[PDB]
Design a binder for this molecule. Structure first.
Ligand code: HEC
Ligand code: HEC
Ligand code: HEC
Ligand code: HEC
Ligand code: HEC
Ligand code: HEC
Ligand code: HEC
Ligand code: HEC
Ligand code: HEC
Ligand code: HEC
Ligand code: HEC
Ligand code: HEC
Ligand code: HEC
Ligand code: HEC
Lengths: 202, 202, 202, 202, 202, 202, 202
């Protein structure tokens, strides 16, 4: 899916003036941030809302992302308003990347918009006190890099990410693995059987 | 019972084109409401009647549910008219969920229909004035989330739910716990001994 | 007395395959009538006769009960012909309730049979004209729910019930309170001293 | 006088194991006859003789009472041979009623025995032909319930009772009112002045 | 005259502790004899003599009355030796009847004493043979109750009474009617004109 | 003649305050003597003389009557000195009997006075020896009551009376019958023809 | 002859308004003298002369009768001047006795007139001295009542009468017996044979 090459066969949206996989994401030189080789323009965090209800631990952090949130990286192409090709910084041929059909914005069901009223919670620090209060959020392992949240049925658990809210924070990349399409839509494991879901919500 | 997986052993009705527990109830993205990850189509409240007699406190609210009533969520599959698989919004494989035998409607004794003339009252605000008038509806605790109605014989009491009629409202989920089948048919405690019944009707 | 649990200590007749107080009387769902949660099979009213003499106001109504008479509910187990356990509708374990000794019918002095030639009158509308004609049937209060017949010596009087013959009708429950055994055999007050009798027959 | 309660102050004979006025006469359930709530054992009529002389209209009926005579009810405790407490049918506490001193039989002047050679005539049908023959037995009124024998000096006359000999029959209750002690020994009017006697024997 | 009530106006002797006409003569219960409701003490017959001369039919019966003679009843208060109030058996208030002035014995001209040497003959059987022998004692009628002695000038004749000497016996009540004072001193007809005397002595 | 009623038509002397025949002679109660019901005051016998001559049998008895002589009864009103109305003992209305004209004494030819020098002999015992001596005084019959003196021409003879002088004594009533006026002046038979005179003086 | 009844057959003079023998001579009451029952008017004795000659003993008594002479009684109707019916005192019917023909005076040979110059001597005392002087006047008997003069040939002699001249006096009745007509004209014995005459004049 994320093979945006012109010669790709399974890509819904692909360029027409380049053949490279990685220019859409990674540039060897002249990148944006010291988070691996990011060459994509990201929006502001002030225009994003998250899931909030009186059953969680994220009440004060229900508005806005952080400046170092990977969820920002994902929504940079998964917001429905940022150009797929027009947001590049280090373009591959000195000009704007040509897009097929002229639709430089993601559409369809994959579009997420700007409101997360219908999405799984992201960018909040899972805490051992919160886990004890709920009593069902598995366990924590700190000896691994990155630290993972222990599960009673899945090997290696789910990776966690460091953010402003804390060093053990759930994120857009917790479930989705961008590069590996072994279990589409790039889930960390094949979802049939609910075994990934049972990893956390036991 | 509510394990609608194809590989389930104790489910009366199960799908044949999926293996996931939660797609029938919860979808990670593109949900219906900001009430936890609801992916089920609910009917209108105008076609529902409730228990009403000259011994209660719910005389003006004996017709119709609210738009935010959990009882609506439960009757969405427990009405006897809404499709068990056809009412999903975010389907798991891009098509309608296949049902065994083709009976996409609940039948048997578990069917409740649309008339509650033979059911325990639901969706009404229990009030301290009403409790004092009756003199037997236990007591109230507001320091817990959700607020519970105190009982003289059962630990932790019964949870209450917030609705349009009020913040302390009895509901379909007051007695039934959807996920925990420790005491089937998903009662909050084992019913033998009438100890749950004695919790309120002392 | 009416604690029909298997673990009960003072019950003459008790079940052996259940432990619940209320299944014998009340079922949460799938009840019989919109009169509180009735799960007991009642007989026909055409086979019942009542007390009749040329000193009362019930001459035309000396034969048969009404379809909404609480006396029917009481005689449903107090007729001497209806099964104590076999008349349930919503059984607690999917089968007929097991009875100790196999005697599913009430016996002894408590048995009332089908003829009320030796019983206090029931199911007739007490009227202010009739009270004035007799001149001793206390007085009437309509501001209370249910309306009561005023007594000159007892606080709160006797409750009355609504029926087909009228809205102020004496009934089996007028003297007997089914749940409260403070004054056995479930009388509304302790009978020693004839103070209950003096409440009406002054 | 007829207040046989243990706490009574003016009763010659009173019980010691009960406090109720009416168990001695009336039981709510399980009575003897369809004549109001009779719970007292009555003797046979074959052992009773009546006043008979060649000046009356009761020559063929001078021996024995009827099975439905109220005089039998009165003599059930006013015969001098039937137990005051031992003749109850529906006892108040599951055992024989305890009597003070052990004298369960009425004694003294109030005792009447079994021979009415010294008593006013009872249980005979007064007839208009007989009244015309004597010419002094007042008049008859049939529009009242029960029918009364008209008197020229007393309001409302004397009530009459229905029996086997006829529908207008003098009886033990014609002069004596069991419940009202306004004019002791329970006469229908105060006897001073002979006005009751002048009501009939003008 | 015989109205012995305390409120009487024409009575020479009256009581002061009662107001009843009939207690002096009749008691409803506990009477003396089976001759109508007699409550007066009578003297012995051995102390009485009668009119005797060689012109009548009563030679062998000139000494003593019978045990069933009404003349005994009359002399019970008309002997001059028996107490007017002290001879009662069933007293009206549990004590001796109080008499005005303390003179409980009849005095004056009305007093008759114990010797009938100056009185009209009583208590002897008038016989048809005796009537034929005298030839002036009217005639006899047996079809009436009581049998009367026919007179040629007076309607209905004189009533006769049954006694030991015979069934057609003259008696104290033959001329005197105790209750009817239409013709004082309680004669059966007004005596002016000798028409009563001419009824027998033609 | 002897009908002294006020309404009488043939009576020379009659009362004005009474209507009774017999009060002048007979009173039912309180009479004077045991000689039938005498209510008239009689004079003394010492003031009476009789017929005496040397041809009879009454020489020693020619002065004075006896205390039991009927002639005394007759002269009680036939002496000319005793009051006709003032000599009553048992008066009919509590007062002296009123007489017409005020003449309470008999006058005229019927007056006899106190001397019998001009009258037929009375009050002497006729004896069989005396009859044999005279040889004309009929015969004697003792089997009749009263004994009569036999006559050869008149049926039933003349009645005789008992007195102190003897049991067969002539008397004022021998010829005169007081009640029967068939042959006035109350003779025992019609005197025309001298047949009564020939009965004795043959 | 002396049967003066109206129905008489042998009487020359008889009444027409009466039928009685004795009213002409004897009245029961109201007579004239104490000489037996005389009811006839007698004349004076001064107008009568008697037989007188110088051969007797009656020289000084030859003029006039005595006031007590029976000869006066006889001449009262045998004088020829006194009325036969008009001289009665006690008349039988309140009026003068009617006489046949109107001749109330005796006539014919039986008339004696007023002069006894032709009659046998009367009313003089026969004396024993006079009898001795004459020597033929029988003898005297004093033991009989009345005293008689003894005769030598006739049984019982002649009765004598008492008068003023003496106790043994001849009289009109000496020979004549007024009542007995055995030997007419009422002689004491049949005169044929002169045996009566020979009784005295021997
Ligand atoms: C972080 C902000 C994100 C973003 C941008 C997306 N996800 Fe998820 N996702 C999860 C599961 C189980 C599915 C399968 C969908 C299904 O079974 O119906 C998905 C799918 C997607 C899609 C495409 C399919 C779709 O239905 O939209 C997209 C574009 C997408 N995701 C974006 C699970 C998780 C999860 C843990 C349960 C987390 C955290 C996220 N997703 C986070 C994100
Ligand atoms: C809210 C609208 C609901 C719905 C949809 C159901 N219930 Fe209840 N329930 C209660 C108890 C004690 C039982 C046991 C039944 C028994 O003992 O016989 C049940 C059972 C059910 C069933 C299945 C079994 C059946 O008999 O129908 C179903 C499908 C069901 N429930 C649906 C008690 C309560 C209660 C408090 C007393 C409340 C509130 C509810 N239930 C509410 C609901
Ligand atoms: C309505 C049809 C009923 C029924 C089914 C029963 N009752 Fe009554 N009850 C009353 C009183 C004073 C007693 C005490 C008995 C006593 O003192 O001896 C009772 C008792 C009973 C019993 C059990 C004991 C018994 O003696 O039978 C039963 C089974 C019973 N009742 C059934 C009084 C009343 C009353 C007002 C006076 C009325 C109405 C009823 N009862 C009605 C009924
Ligand atoms: C029907 C069989 C009965 C019975 C059992 C009794 N009575 Fe009478 N009663 C009447 C009157 C006027 C009195 C007063 C007594 C008085 O004045 O002296 C009574 C009294 C009694 C008593 C108690 C007192 C006593 O003297 O015995 C008793 C126990 C009693 N009664 C029993 C009048 C009548 C009457 C109409 C005149 C009739 C009918 C009855 N009584 C009937 C009965
Ligand atoms: C039966 C033993 C009796 C008794 C006790 C009494 N009588 Fe008579 N009575 C009769 C008449 C005609 C009178 C009127 C009196 C009169 O006219 O003077 C009476 C009166 C009385 C009285 C009171 C008045 C008085 O003079 O004493 C009394 C107390 C009395 N009686 C008592 C007639 C008869 C009669 C038939 C002729 C008979 C029988 C009786 N009486 C009997 C009795
Ligand atoms: C007893 C002492 C008496 C009394 C008081 C009276 N009598 Fe006589 N009597 C007799 C006869 C034949 C008559 C008729 C008179 C006549 O024919 O003229 C009478 C009449 C009377 C009267 C009234 C008429 C009169 O002439 O005086 C009276 C008042 C009277 N009597 C009173 C006959 C007898 C007789 C037998 C011959 C005897 C005895 C008596 N009487 C006795 C008495
Ligand atoms: C006394 C004064 C008298 C009276 C009035 C009468 N007598 Fe005599 N009498 C006597 C005898 C023997 C005869 C028979 C005459 C004869 O035989 O012829 C009579 C008759 C009469 C009559 C009628 C006949 C007549 O011849 O007149 C009358 C009227 C009469 N008497 C009147 C005898 C005596 C005698 C003794 C001898 C005495 C005395 C009397 N009589 C006296 C009287
Ligand atoms: C859009 C998404 C792309 C595309 C089209 C490519 N890459 Fe990647 N890549 C992407 C992200 C968001 C990250 C970092 C994720 C994280 O830090 O959690 C990366 C990272 C890499 C890395 C180093 C990290 C590792 O190896 O685990 C490499 C070597 C890499 N990417 C290679 C790569 C190549 C060869 C591509 C085309 C042939 C290519 N990427 C495309 C996001 C995206
Ligand atoms: C139908 C009912 C289902 C089924 C088949 C599953 N879930 Fe649940 N779930 C359901 C409801 C009505 C609710 C909310 C109830 C309320 O708000 O009172 C939930 C909630 C959850 C949650 C979060 C709430 C909590 O944990 O207390 C989780 C983590 C969850 N559900 C998980 C889950 C999984 C893992 C399932 C398959 C393995 C699954 N659900 C099925 C209703 C239903
Ligand atoms: C047979 C009788 C039973 C038994 C064994 C139980 N209940 Fe009751 N109950 C019964 C009747 C006939 C009625 C209605 C009476 C009327 O309407 O007049 C009820 C009512 C109730 C109620 C609500 C009415 C109220 O509270 O006043 C409750 C809460 C209730 N019953 C509870 C209850 C429980 C907890 C029992 C076992 C622990 C139980 N009942 C048994 C009749 C009968
Ligand atoms: C012995 C007598 C008693 C006693 C101790 C009580 N009652 Fe009565 N009662 C009795 C009789 C013989 C009758 C019927 C008489 C008839 O039918 O002529 C009654 C009747 C009643 C009635 C209904 C008739 C009415 O009201 O007129 C009542 C309501 C009643 N009795 C009440 C009552 C009470 C309350 C008593 C004790 C507090 C009581 N009775 C005692 C005889 C006798
Ligand atoms: C003394 C005498 C009294 C008095 C003061 C009263 N009564 Fe009478 N009564 C009396 C006698 C001797 C008799 C019987 C006479 C007989 O048998 O010949 C009676 C009879 C009655 C009767 C029934 C006989 C009838 O009616 O013919 C009655 C109804 C009656 N008595 C009534 C009565 C009343 C009402 C009195 C006071 C108001 C009363 N009596 C006084 C004697 C005497
Ligand atoms: C004055 C004389 C009178 C009057 C006015 C009445 N009677 Fe008589 N009565 C009288 C006497 C002297 C005697 C007795 C005579 C004797 O013993 O020889 C009587 C007797 C009676 C008798 C009974 C004797 C019988 O019947 O033979 C009766 C019944 C009688 N009397 C009745 C009576 C009546 C009814 C009178 C008025 C209607 C009446 N008498 C008046 C004297 C006198
Ligand atoms: C005229 C003479 C008469 C008549 C018509 C009658 N009697 Fe006589 N009677 C007469 C006299 C003068 C005397 C007395 C004579 C004397 O005393 O000597 C008498 C006497 C009697 C007597 C009594 C004397 C006796 O019996 O001896 C009687 C009983 C008598 N009379 C009866 C009587 C009768 C019955 C008459 C009519 C039937 C009658 N008398 C007529 C004179 C005269």
């Amino acid at each position: 899916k994320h093979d945006l090459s012109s010669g790709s066969t399974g890509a819904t949206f692909k360029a027409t003036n380049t053949d490279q996989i990685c220019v859409f994401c990674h540039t060897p030189h002249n990148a944006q941030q010291d988070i691996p080789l990011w060459n994509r323009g990201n929006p502001t965090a002030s225009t994003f809302t998250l899931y909030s209800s009186s059953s969680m631990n994220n009440v004060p952090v229900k508005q806005g992302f952080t400046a170092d949130s990977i969820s920002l990286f994902c929504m940079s192409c998964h917001d429905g308003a940022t150009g797929l090709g027009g947001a590049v910084h280090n373009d591959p041929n000195g000009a704007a990347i040509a897009m097929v059909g002229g639709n430089d914005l993601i559409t369809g069901e994959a579009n997420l918009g700007t409101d997360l009223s219908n999405d799984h919670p992201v960018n909040f620090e899972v805490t051992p006190a919160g886990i004890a209060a709920d009593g069902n959020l598995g366990a924590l392992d700190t000896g691994t890099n990155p630290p993972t949240m222990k599960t009673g049925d899945v090997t290696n658990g789910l990776p966690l990410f460091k953010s402003a809210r804390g060093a053990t924070t759930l994120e857009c990349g917790s479930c989705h693995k961008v590069h590996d399409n072994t279990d589409a839509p790039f889930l960390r494991t094949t979802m049939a059987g609910s075994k990934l879901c049972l990893g956390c919500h036991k």
